[PDB]
């Protein structure tokens, strides 16, 4: 299995710079070109350039020449993209993507991108960064079920997207629904995550939501009890 | 820099074709058109490369061709899971994407919302705040109306509601939040979240 794992979301003020990493595994890192592609929220894909992890040569889209530098550390199979003099229309999900065939094949790196990182959201804003407040949502059997109950976590009043929520440190995945956030009139976001569990497990199994808001460097592990 | 329609629709089982037009310097001169499929909240997925070749494991319902300066993605026997955005791409001295095509599959049956309403937590009350949480899932089409009541009277202040958003099963989800003071929450008999979808209404009520 080929895998591209990117660094976590960031927030920046206008004029600063951001550096995103991409750790590759499952293949010979120096044999395939690495591209970087971004996507503003609700908009299309925009190529930024590529690096050859062998030799380290680069090629950049005209739009970003003189603002962007791509590098790699072959000793840890990691590519980097740094974008400077940031502006608010640089707000976007930044992806790394590996070329289709290796660099011996004719027409690499112009054929296509088979393997994609999970994406890194970077928000460029001059507004204040705010961390979430996390409140437990105690189990309720009223909706749902046949012998089940729904419980959750309310994640309130955080600014830059995104927030991630896992349950029991990733050991609980079936029945988890994390809802898209609302943007409130205050300019802050709020979301909820709910998991449906067996009712008979309530007195014996502990449920914890793991809330991660990387833009404020905040993690909350909130136990949800009856 | 390439031109494709912003949104197309077809019916299940039928075939549909999405066009991607460049110039004679790119699409017209090279056999280096690729196509990508992107579901909500996921990375793009490479569906076609070199105009007409399919990566391993991509369904043979997807095919590609080119004529003059226009490349074409064709999907046979459309299914509900084919709803997504589709991007074309071509060498052009650089990597050049089209603007993207949103594909909708008509004929999907109505699905009624499932509603969960949570009262404010004891922890939040101790922090001198109160939030009611109305979570709405599995509805289609993606249009919903949400209305809150304190006892029997309407409440419009402190209400925040998302636009419907597509989930993985092609049905939609939405959230509404009612912010109150602790004093307000404890001074009424009940509060209700009332969800209306395609003329039918679900109301859930909680009380202190």
Residues 6+ apart with CB under 8 A from A48: A35, A36, A37, A38, A60, A61, A63, A64, A68, A81
Mark whether A96 and A190 lie in a shared domain. Answer: no
Cα-Cα-Cα-Cα dihedral of A105, A106, A110, A112, to 10°? -50
Domain that holds residue A217: 133-224
Residues A10 and A44 both lie in one domain = yes
Query: At which residue do the structure tokens 């959201």 appear?
Result: A121
A8 plus A120 within the same structural domain: yes
Q: Are residues A99 and A153 in the same domain?
A: no
Q: Which residue has the tokens 């530098």?
A: A69
In sequence order, the β-bridge partners of residue A9 are: none
Task: Tell me the three state secondary structure of residue A32.
Answer: coil
Quote the minimal CA–CA distance from A6 to chain B in Å. Answer: 12
Out of B34, B100, B160, whose CB is closest to A182?
Answer: B160
- Domain edge (last residue) among A93, A124, A155: A124
Query: Which residues in chain B touch residue A135, judged by CB atoms under 8 angstroms apart?
Result: 120-121, 123-124, 131
Closest CA to A115 of A220, A182, A46, A25: A25
The answer to whether A129 and A12 are in contact (CB under 8 A) is no
Q: Which of A194, A20, A13 is nearest to A118 (CA)?
A: A20
Residues on chain B touching A133 (C-beta within 8 angstroms): 127
What's the CA gap between B2 and B10, in Å, rounded? 23
> For the purposes of burial, counting CB atoms within 10 Å of the CB of A95, is it exposed (0-12), middle (13-18) or buried (19 or more)?
buried
B/e letters for B86-113, b = 16+ CB within 10 Å, e = fewer, are bbbbbbbebbbbbbbbebebeeeeebeb
Cis bond leading into B141, ω under 30°?
Answer: yes
Instruction: Please tell me whether residues A13 and A107 are part of one structural domain.
Output: yes
Q: How many whole angstroms separate alpha carbon B146 and alpha carbon B151?
A: 16
Helix, strand, coil % in chain B, rounded to nearest 5: 5, 50, 40
- In chain B, what are the domains? 7-105 (2.60.40.10), 114-206 (2.60.40.10)
CATH number assigned to the domain comprising residue A179: 2.60.40.10
Interchain proximity B97–A46, CB inside 8 Å: yes
For chain B, which residues lie within 8 Å of any Cβ of chain A, measuring from their own Cβ? 32, 34, 36, 43-46, 49-50, 55, 87, 89, 91, 94-100, 114-116, 118, 120-121, 123-124, 127, 131, 133, 135, 137, 160-162, 165, 173, 175-177, 204
**Which of A92, A124, A156 is where one domain is finished?**
A124
Among candidate residues B163, B57, B48, B35, the one with its CA nearest the CA of residue A45: B35
C-alpha torsion sign, points B27, B37, A215, A169: negative
Pairing outcome for strands A113-116 and A92-99? antiparallel
- Shared domain for A117 and A141, answered yes or no, is no
Neighbours of B142 (CB within 10 A): 16
Q: Which two tokens stand for residue A128?
A: 């204040």
Domain boundary among A124, A146, A174: A124
The verdict on a CB contact (< 8 Å) between B127 and A133 is yes
Question: What resolution, expressed in A, was reported for this entry?
Answer: 2.1
Whole-number Å distance between alpha carbons of A100 and B168: 27
Per the structure, the count of domains in chain A is 2
Same domain, A149 and A185: yes
Kindly state whether residues A111 and A20 are assigned to the same domain.
yes
Report the 10 Å Cβ neighbour count for B122.
Answer: 10
Do the chains contact at B124 and A100, CB–CB below 8 Å?
no
What DSSP state is assigned to residue B93?
S
Q: How far apart are CA A186 and CA A208, in angstroms?
A: 29
Q: Do A219 and A164 belong together in one domain? A: yes
Q: Copy the structure tokens of residue B191.
A: 């509060």
């Amino acid at each position: 299995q080929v895998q591209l794992v990117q660094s976590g979301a960031e927030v920046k003020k206008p004029g600063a710079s951001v550096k995103v990493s991409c750790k590759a595994s499952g293949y010979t890192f120096t044999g395939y070109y690495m591209h970087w592609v971004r996507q503003a929220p609700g908009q299309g894909l925009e190529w930024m350039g590529w690096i050859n992890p062998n030799s380290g040569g680069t090629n950049y889209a005209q739009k970003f020449q003189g603002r962007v530098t791509m590098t790699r550390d072959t000793s840890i199979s990691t590519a980097y993209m740094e974008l400077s003099r940031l502006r608010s229309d640089d707000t976007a999900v930044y992806y790394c993507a590996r070329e289709m065939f290796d660099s011996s094949a004719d027409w690499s790196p112009w054929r296509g991108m088979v393997a994609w990182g999970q994406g890194t959201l970077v928000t460029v804003s001059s507004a204040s960064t705010k961390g979430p407040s996390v409140f437990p949502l105690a189990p309720s059997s009223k909706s749902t079920s046949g012998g089940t109950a729904a419980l959750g976590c309310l994640v309130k009043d955080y600014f830059p997207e995104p927030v991630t929520v896992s349950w029991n440190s990733g050991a609980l995945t079936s029945g988890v629904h994390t809802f898209p956030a609302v943007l409130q009139s205050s300019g802050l976001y709020s979301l909820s995550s709910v998991v449906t569990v067996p009712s008979s497990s309530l007195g014996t199994q502990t449920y914890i939501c793991n809330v991660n808001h990387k833009p404020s460097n905040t993690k909350v592990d909130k136990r949800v009890e009856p | 820099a390439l031109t494709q329609p912003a949104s197309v629709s077809g019916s299940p089982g039928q075939s549909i074709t999405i066009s991607c037009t460049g110039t004679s310097s790119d699409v017209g001169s090279y056999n280096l058109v690729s196509w990508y499929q992107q579901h909500p909240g996921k990375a793009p997925k490479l569906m076609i490369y070199e105009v007409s070749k399919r990566p391993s494991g991509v369904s043979n319902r997807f095919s590609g061709s080119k004529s003059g300066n226009t490349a074409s993605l064709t999907i046979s026997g459309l299914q509900a899971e084919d709803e997504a955005d589709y991007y074309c791409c071509s060498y052009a001295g650089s990597v050049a994407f089209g603007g993207g095509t949103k594909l909708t599959v008509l004929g999907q049956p109505k699905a009624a919302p499932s509603v969960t309403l949570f009262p404010p937590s004891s922890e939040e009350l101790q922090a001198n705040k109160a939030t009611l949480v109305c979570l709405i899932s599995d509805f289609y089409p993606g249009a919903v109306t949400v209305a809150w009541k304190a006892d029997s009277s309407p409440v419009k202040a402190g209400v925040e509601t998302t636009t419907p958003s597509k989930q993985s099963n092609n049905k939609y989800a939405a959230s509404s939040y009612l912010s109150l003071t602790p004093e307000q929450w404890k001074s009424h008999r009940s509060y209700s979240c009332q969800v209306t979808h395609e003329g039918s209404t679900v109301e859930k009520t909680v009380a202190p």
